[PDB]
Amino acid sequence: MTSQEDYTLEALTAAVRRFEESEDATTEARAAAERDRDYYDEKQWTAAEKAALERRGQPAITFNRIKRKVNALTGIEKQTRKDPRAFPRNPDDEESAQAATDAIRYVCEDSRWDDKRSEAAKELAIEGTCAIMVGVKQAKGGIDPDIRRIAWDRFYYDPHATAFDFEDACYMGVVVWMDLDKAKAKYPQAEDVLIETWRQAQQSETYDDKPKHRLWADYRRRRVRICEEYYLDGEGWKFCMFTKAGFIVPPMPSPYIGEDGEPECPIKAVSLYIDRDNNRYGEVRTMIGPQDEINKRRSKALHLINSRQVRVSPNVQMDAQSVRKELSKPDGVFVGDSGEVEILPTQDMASANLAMLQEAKNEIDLLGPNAALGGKAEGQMSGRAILAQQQGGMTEAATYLDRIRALSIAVYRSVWARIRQVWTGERWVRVTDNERNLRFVGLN
């Protein structure tokens, strides 16, 4: 077809500028979070160190300890699972709470809120940012509120936001990768802005497709990236959908009515730690330091052991390196007088490296969770000491549970607002099985 396009550059720049600054301002934080996640995923060696170890013949061995602490924190959060509840401010409002406590609960069982909360907590432990979308979905009885989980690498926010729930954030959005056929089926009007994206980006791989190497997007399975962004305009919150080539949905007011009857951003995001540069990081960062000392000192102590240092007399008619390699072998031989070869001592180096490795292991074990909440500790200690260490670790983990609680409360509030916005009388009767709940239909 003709498809007259390429209207102007100003419109495209104004459309993609917010995503551009979101990508640019959080490059270091995203790289650090990706490194922490890779450390959690049994990837604690760089390419250069692995190449050097392969060159020297030493295998690369990783003693992963971050995963144990992250699993302990996640299990602690799982064991403290709670249910949504509405409490009446005054006795005459009691029945009103008895409505909401039901309705919200239904949503938390319709969307499997437990699993989404669990993965949100996992990302909070690892990357320090959780994003939950409170939207709508089609059901048999009508439209129902729906809870969706946004991956840390598929969600961008206002870099200038300082609060941990993003009260002051000007905008936030989600990147979604969709097949071209599905995109055309879902939005046939915006066929002129859906452009193939086959080339992978190496400078910024955070918002690309999860499988980096995909040799099927040429013609077989074409994939595109679409950004859904909600931004606080002077009039109010506005929602838009766009791509790198244009606007899928032109800037329009947000369709999700908020708590106070005004359009609101459905995305609820929480963070664990914020630095002086507004970079958000999780607890895994604290374990990044010692973990390397667990690995590197492991390698060096192994290198000092399978190799020997020898001084060779110049009268020897053999290569020094060959003689050293022969003497390093358990069944090696040498032909010569006593003084031709002298083995220098290197046991002190290995012993010192082993002691430093043990010290680093103790430090990481005490670091973060006290290692007793995971039932590991250090041994040779009484039960009362174990309980005291577990209580101390639980106290040190109060902020994590507080973040989870705040995210849950925000999600429940958005769920109640969406229920008031979209539920009808028939849905109220079908779900709650109470006639009086028809009083609660709509916001008036």
Partner: protein
Amino acid sequence: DAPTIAAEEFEQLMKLASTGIVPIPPDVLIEASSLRNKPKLLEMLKQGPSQE
């Protein structure tokens, strides 16, 4: 965390009745439980007094 609101309600009834401070009648208690023979127990407890 409770599977249903009725389960938490029954647990609260247990907590109130164990102390013995308030008198909880058994009919409402059975009605709030999760027993399969609940209609039979309710009918047997709510049956009218004997003509004697």
